[PDB]
């Protein structure tokens, strides 16, 4: 098919199961991209589903804080996902290696996360798997933009209509509604944003236990706090936002729009 | 405090 003839393959960029990604060049255009090479038939029945989903849903999102898919392509026993090239790594690498972010830079960070997420919800897409590992930095530059990635677990919703889309995502960042087989929708992303914002500011998550059972219990209960000392110097509006995001009833939980208006993110 | 380590994405309820 098209990939072999249009795209020239370069260095090894990253790995992830039966899918090596490489820097590639659309030769005629000259422009360079990240091309996710994926083994076909080494993959499972469910994996091909999550691939169509990824392809379809990414080919829906035009935003500077969402990694753009430029071309989904299938050939002999290999599928090709062509993305915006990004060399700033995961937001996880950067948090880990900087302990935490200042309020200034945490606000600047979750702002971009909130706008990406809002475009997502405007095109009726819910991501269900926001986390520092699934957020990428444009380049190694200071100030480099934050680009939302990995839509393998993303789902399309119809208007503001809620439903059981299955138990899917990541133990730490999962919403209470999901933990209670409740019909869920747009708001599960905000819960996830809350968790990220807490991490951002102190460098650890609000909910965590060595026993999944106890982790899901405290998540379900909204059982987080803002410990001393670290949390003592932190503006009470920053905390406010996190309450409004880690609100436990998704009805009265804050939206992506409401949040981008909040004084902790807006005046910035 | 609690720990920031990396976590993986599940497609189903896998009780750990």
Swiss-Prot record, chain A:
<comment type="function">
    <text>Calcium/calmodulin-dependent protein kinase that functions autonomously after Ca(2+)/calmodulin-binding and autophosphorylation, and is involved in various processes, such as synaptic plasticity, neurotransmitter release and long-term potentiation. Member of the NMDAR signaling complex in excitatory synapses, it regulates NMDAR-dependent potentiation of the AMPAR and therefore excitatory synaptic transmission. Regulates dendritic spine development. Also regulates the migration of developing neurons. Phosphorylates the transcription factor FOXO3 to activate its transcriptional activity.</text>
</comment>
<dbReference type="GO" id="GO:2001222">
    <property type="term" value="P:regulation of neuron migration"/>
</dbReference>
<dbReference type="GO" id="GO:0004683">
    <property type="term" value="F:calcium/calmodulin-dependent protein kinase activity"/>
</dbReference>
<dbReference type="GO" id="GO:0042802">
    <property type="term" value="F:identical protein binding"/>
</dbReference>
<dbReference type="GO" id="GO:0043197">
    <property type="term" value="C:dendritic spine"/>
</dbReference>
<dbReference type="GO" id="GO:0035458">
    <property type="term" value="P:cellular response to interferon-beta"/>
</dbReference>
<feature type="domain" description="Protein kinase">
    <location>
        <begin position="7"/>
        <end position="265"/>
    </location>
</feature>
<feature type="active site" description="Proton acceptor">
    <location>
        <position position="129"/>
    </location>
</feature>
<dbReference type="GO" id="GO:0014069">
    <property type="term" value="C:postsynaptic density"/>
</dbReference>
<keyword id="KW-0770">Synapse</keyword>
<dbReference type="GO" id="GO:0048168">
    <property type="term" value="P:regulation of neuronal synaptic plasticity"/>
</dbReference>
<dbReference type="GO" id="GO:0006816">
    <property type="term" value="P:calcium ion transport"/>
</dbReference>
<dbReference type="GO" id="GO:0051092">
    <property type="term" value="P:positive regulation of NF-kappaB transcription factor activity"/>
</dbReference>
<keyword id="KW-0991">Intellectual disability</keyword>
<keyword id="KW-0067">ATP-binding</keyword>
<keyword id="KW-0564">Palmitate</keyword>
<dbReference type="GO" id="GO:0005634">
    <property type="term" value="C:nucleus"/>
</dbReference>
<dbReference type="GO" id="GO:1990443">
    <property type="term" value="P:peptidyl-threonine autophosphorylation"/>
</dbReference>
<dbReference type="GO" id="GO:0046928">
    <property type="term" value="P:regulation of neurotransmitter secretion"/>
</dbReference>
<dbReference type="GO" id="GO:0042803">
    <property type="term" value="F:protein homodimerization activity"/>
</dbReference>
<keyword id="KW-0449">Lipoprotein</keyword>
<keyword id="KW-0723">Serine/threonine-protein kinase</keyword>
Swiss-Prot record, chain B:
<comment type="subunit">
    <text>Heterotetramer. Forms heterotetrameric channels composed of two GluN1/zeta subunits (GRIN1), and two identical GluN2/epsilon subunits (GRIN2A, GRIN2B, GRIN2C or GRIN2D) or GluN3 subunits (GRIN3A or GRIN3B) (in vitro). Can also form heterotetrameric channels that contain at least two GluN1 subunits and at least two different GluN2 subunits (or a combination of one GluN2 and one GluN3 subunits) (in vitro). In vivo, the subunit composition may depend on the expression levels of the different subunits. Found in a complex with GRIN1 and GRIN3B. Found in a complex with GRIN1, GRIN3A and PPP2CB.</text>
</comment>
<feature type="region of interest" description="Interaction with DAPK1">
    <location>
        <begin position="1"/>
        <end position="10"/>
    </location>
</feature>
<comment type="function">
    <text>Component of N-methyl-D-aspartate (NMDA) receptors (NMDARs) that function as heterotetrameric, ligand-gated cation channels with high calcium permeability and voltage-dependent block by Mg(2+). Participates in synaptic plasticity for learning and memory formation by contributing to the long-term depression (LTD) of hippocampus membrane currents. Channel activation requires binding of the neurotransmitter L-glutamate to the GluN2 subunit, glycine or D-serine binding to the GluN1 subunit, plus membrane depolarization to eliminate channel inhibition by Mg(2+).</text>
</comment>
<protein>
    <recommendedName>
        <fullName>Glutamate receptor ionotropic, NMDA 2B</fullName>
    </recommendedName>
</protein>
<feature type="modified residue" description="Phosphoserine; by DAPK1">
    <location>
        <position position="9"/>
    </location>
</feature>
<comment type="similarity">
    <text>Belongs to the glutamate-gated ion channel (TC 1.A.10.1) family. NR2B/GRIN2B subfamily.</text>
</comment>
């Amino acid at each position: 098919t098209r990939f072999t003839e249009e795209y020239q393959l370069f260095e090894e960029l990253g790995k992830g199961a039966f899918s090596v990604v490489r820097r590639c060049v659309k030769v005629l255009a000259g422009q360079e991209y990240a091309a996710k090479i994926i083994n076909t038939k080494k993959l499972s029945a469910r994996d091909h589903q999550k691939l169509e989903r990824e392809a379809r849903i990414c080919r829906l999102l035009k935003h500077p804080n969402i990694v753009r898919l430029h071309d989904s392509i299938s050939e002999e026993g290999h599928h090709y996902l062509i993305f915006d090239l990004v060399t700033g790594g995961e937001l996880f690498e950067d948090i880990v290696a900087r302990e935490y972010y200042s309020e200034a830079d945490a606000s600047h960070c979750i702002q971009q996360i909130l706008e990406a997420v809002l475009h997502c919800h405007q095109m009726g897409v819910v991501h269900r798997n926001l986390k520092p590992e699934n957020l990428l930095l444009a380049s190694k530059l200071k100030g480099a933009a934050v680009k939302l990635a990995d839509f393998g677990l993303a789902i399309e919703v119809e208007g503001e209509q809620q439903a059981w889309f299955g138990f899917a995502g990541t133990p730490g960042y999962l919403s209470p509604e999901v933990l209670r087989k409740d019909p869920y929708g747009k708001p599960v992303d905000l819960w996830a944003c809350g968790v990220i914002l807490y991490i951002l500011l102190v460098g650890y998550p609000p909910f965590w236990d060595e026993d999944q059972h106890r982790l899901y219990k405290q998540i379900k209960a909204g059982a987080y706090d803002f410990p001393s000392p670290e949390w003592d110097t932190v503006t009470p509006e920053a905390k406010d936002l996190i309450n409004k995001m880690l609100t436990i009833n998704p009805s009265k939980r804050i939206t992506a729009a409401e949040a981008l208006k909040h004084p902790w993110i807006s005046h910035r | 405090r609690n720990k920031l380590r990396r976590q993986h994405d599940y497609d189903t309820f896998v009780d750990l």
